[PDB]
Assembly symmetry: D2
Homo-oligomer: 249 residues x 4
C-alpha cells in the first residue's frame, strides 16, 4: 500500500507491460487510469483489473483525445502523481523498404505522443511526481529491419535527460524503463500470423536472453512501480534496463 493515495495514469493500459503495470500499481493502492483505442479491450482490462481502476477510451496521436483524457482527470481526481506511457508500437521494415507512412506512424505514436502526453499532464502533476517513459534495449542496440523502431526508442530515452532540467523547478523527475524481450501479444503478433510460427519466434528470442527466458510482463511492471514510488527519490534522468542481461553483455 506504499502508493496509496497516489493517482497513476498508464497510456496503453489494455495490454502487455502497461496492463501488468496498471495491475501492479493498483495492488499498491494507487488509483489508476488506463487508456485504450478500442472500447471492448478497455472494458475487459478495466473489468480484469478492477481494484478501483478507471479506463478512458483514447488515441494518444490526436490532441482532442489527450485534452478530453486530462480533462477527465482534472474533473475526477485533479492531481496526477504517476505517469507511464505504454502506447507505443513496433513494425518491421528494412532500409530500402521503409515507407514514409511507416516512419510517420512509428514516431507519432512512439515519440510525439509521449511529448504531448507529458506536456498536457504537467499542470496536474504536483512537485515530487514521477514520470516513467517507455524505452527499449532496441534503442541502444542493432536489430535488422527495425531501424525506425530503435531510433524512436533512443529518442524517448534522450527526452528524459533534457526533461530533467526542464522539470527541475516543478520537482517532477523523469526516468526511463527499457525492457528486453517480454512475453506479450505485441511480441507474439510480431512473430507471425501462425500460432506455432509466432511461437518459434518467441523460442528464438528466449535463446538470445542470457538467463534464457522471456520476461513475464510483471517483472517489467515491478521496475515501473519502483520508479513510481518514493524509493526512487534520488533517481532522475536514468535508464533502468530489464533485459535478462541481453544488452548488458
Amino acid at each position: 500500500k506504499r502508493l496509496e493515495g497516489k493517482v497513476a495514469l498508464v497510456t496503453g493500459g489494455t495490454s502487455g507491460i502497461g496492463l501488468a503495470t496498471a495491475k501492479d500499481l493498483a495492488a499498491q493502492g494507487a488509483r489508476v487510469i488506463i487508456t485504450g483505442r478500442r472500447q471492448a479491450e478497455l472494458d475487459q482490462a478495466v473489468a480484469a483489473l478492477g481494484q478501483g481502476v478507471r479506463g478512458v477510451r483514447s488515441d494518444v496521436t490526436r490532441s482532442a483525445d489527450l485534452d478530453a483524457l486530462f480533462e477527465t482527470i482534472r474533473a475526477t481526481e485533479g492531481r496526477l502523481d504517476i505517469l507511464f506511457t505504454n502506447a507505443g508500437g513496433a513494425s518491421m521494415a528494412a532500409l530500402g523498404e521503409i515507407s514514409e507512412q511507416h516512419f510517420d506512424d512509428t514516431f507519432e505514436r512512439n515519440v510525439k505522443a509521449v511529448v504531448f502526453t507529458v506536456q498536457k499532464a504537467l499542470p496536474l502533476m504536483p512537485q515530487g511526481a514521477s514520470i516513467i517513459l517507455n524505452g527499449s534495449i532496441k534503442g541502444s542496440t542493432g536489430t535488422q529491419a527495425f531501424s525506425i523502431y530503435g531510433a524512436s526508442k533512443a529518442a524517448v530515452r534522450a527526452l528524459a535527460r533534457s526533461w530533467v532540467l526542464d522539470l527541475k523547478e516543478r520537482g517532477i523527475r523523469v526516468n526511463v524503463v527499457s525492457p528486453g524481450s517480454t512475453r506479450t501479444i505485441g511480441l507474439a503478433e510480431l512473430g507471425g500470423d501462425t500460432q506455432e510460427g509466432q511461437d518459434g519466434t518467441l523460442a528464438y528470442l528466449a535463446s538470445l536472453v542470457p538467463i534464457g527466458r522471456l520476461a513475464d510482463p510483471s517483472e517489467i511492471a515491478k521496475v515501473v512501480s519502483f520508479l513510481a514510488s518514493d524509493d526512487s527519490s534520488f533517481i532522475n534522468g536514468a535508464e533502468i534496463t530489464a533485459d535478462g542481461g541481453q544488452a548488458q553483455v
Copy 2:
C-alpha cells in the same frame, strides 16, 4: 589524393560543418556534390570550394527534391561512394511550451530527412561505400529547452546501429560523427540577433568546453574525412565524438 576517384554528397554543404567537410573532401581529390536551400549561398559556396565541388539546390524535407538530386547524380557521375548528412537544425522550446510545429519541423529535418536521404542514396552506393550521419553530444546529454533537438540527434545515432545490419550484405558501412560546440553561423544564431548577444552566448559555451575553446568547423570535418576514407574500414555503426572533452568528463 587519398579520396580521388571517389564521389561524395554533402547535404547542407553551404554552411558550417558541411561546408568545411566539402572543402576537406575536395582537397583529398573527391568529387563533391553539395546541397543548399538558397541558390545564392549554394553558388557562392561552390565558387569558393573549387572545380571538384558542384551544387544542387534542394530541401531535404521535400521528397521531390531528394529524388531530383539523386537522379542528377546518377546521370552526372553514376555512383555515390561517400554520403554525409549535414542538413539539420536546432530550435529551443522548454517542456510546457513545445508546439506541434516545433516538433514536426525538427524531426522531419533531422530524422525523417536522414532516413530518406540514405534510402534514396543506396542504389548509387557501391560495396565499400561509407555513410556518415550527423549526431550531437546533445543526443547523449540533457540541455534545458533543447529536448526535441537532443531526441532527434539520439534517433540519428540509433539508426546507424541497425543500418549496419541492414547494409551488411551490401558492404556499406554507417557511422556517426557527434560534434560538441562548434563556431558556425547556426551556433551564433541560436545565441541571439544582437551581436553582443551571440558573443556572450559563444563565450559561455566555450567556458563549458574543457579545453576552453569552441571547435573550428574544420576540426569536425577532419573526423568526417577519416570516416569517409578507407582507413575507417573496420569502423561500423560507431559514434566518434569530437567535443573537446565536454561529454566525456
Copy 3:
C-alpha cells in the same frame, strides 16, 4: 516482510550507504551480516542496527578475514541470498602526483577485494540469489585528481557484465548501483578536517546535482533493496544510477 527468510551480507556496513542498506534490508526482514574494518565502530553500528543485524570484524583486502567471515555465515545461517559490497575508498591524487601505494590501495579494496568477496561467497549462495556491487558515477565521468578512483569504479561495473555469463548456470544475478554524491562521513572527510571546509565542499557538490541536493544514504539503500528483492528478477548485469540527474544530463 519482503526479505523475510533472506540472509544478506553487506561489507563496509558500519558507515554511510552500507549502514543505510543494512538498516533497510533488516527492516525488510532480512537477516543481515555487516562487516567492519575497525572493532569499536563495528560494535556501535550493530547496536544501532540492533535486532536482525550481526557483525563480523574483517578487512576485505586480507583473505583470512574473508575466510573467517564466510565460515561463520556458513556455520550459522548456512546460505547467502543477498551480497552487497560497500567496502571501498576514494583518495585524491592528480596525474603526476599519483603514488604506487595510492594505486595499490585503491585497486586492492575497490576491485580486487570485490572479486574475492564474490568468489568466496558463491558456495553459500543459492539459485536465485542477488549480488549488488558498489559503483559510482565517477566510473563513467571525469573528475580532476580522482582518476584512479574512477578507474576502479569502472572496473567494478565491468565485472558485472561478464559475471552474468559466469553465473548463469548457478542462477545468481549481478547488478551495480552507482550513487551520485551522497551525504556521508567519508564525503565530508574528503572535503577535509575544517568543519567549515566540509560544509563548503558539501554545498559545492549539491550545486552540481540538478535537483540541487545531496542524497540521503537511505535513498541509495532503497536501490540496493530493490535489486536485492525478487522484483529485480529480470535485471542482470545492469547499472542503476541514483545521482539526482548529474551524470544523466
Copy 4:
C-alpha cells in the same frame, strides 16, 4: 605522407600485433618512433623490419626501473614526446570461481598500473598539443565468459582518460582511447590455444561474431591510432573510438 613529420612517438609493446602495426604506420607518416619490447631478439626484428628511424628499447613496463631507463633515453636523445601509445597489455581467461590472486594481479599490473605510471613518467617530456592514446577493448563495455578480469582492466583504462582530460587540461595534452574488436594477432591466435587447428577454429568463430564477418587486420586498428596521434584529432578529448566491425554497436 609527412603529416606526422617532426613528431616523436613512443609505442609500448611495439614488437607485435597492433603496436607493431602502429609503429609502422606512424613511421610511414614521418614520425620518429620508439618501441619497447620485453625480449631483445623480438625487439631487434621489429626495429630492423620497421627501418625508417625507429629505435627499440628493451623494457618491461611493469618494472619501474625499466620505465625510468626508457624515458631517460628519450630525454637524452629526442628531448620530447609528442605521441604516446600504450600497447603493452595481456589477456588470460579465468571464470569466476577459478580466479586466482596471481591471475588478478598480473592482469591489473600490466593492463592498468603500468599504463598509469607509463603516462605519469612520460608527462614532463610531453609539450602542449601532445596526444596520448590508451589501449582499450570492446571487452571493457561487454560481457565475455571467463574474461571478467580482463574486461574490468580495459574498462579501467577507458575511465582513466575521462579524468585525465581534466588533470591534463592546462598542460594541453589530450587523452583518447582506441577500443578494438577482434583483430588477427598472434596474441589473439595464441589465446585460441597451442594447436593451429584450435587457433583456426577459434579465429573462425570470432569472425562469425563480427557483423562485417571478418577479423581486423592490425593495420586497420593502427589507422585509428594515427588519426588520434595526428593534429586532425585536435577537438577529440577523452573519447573512445571503437573499431570493432560493428560488433559492440549492434
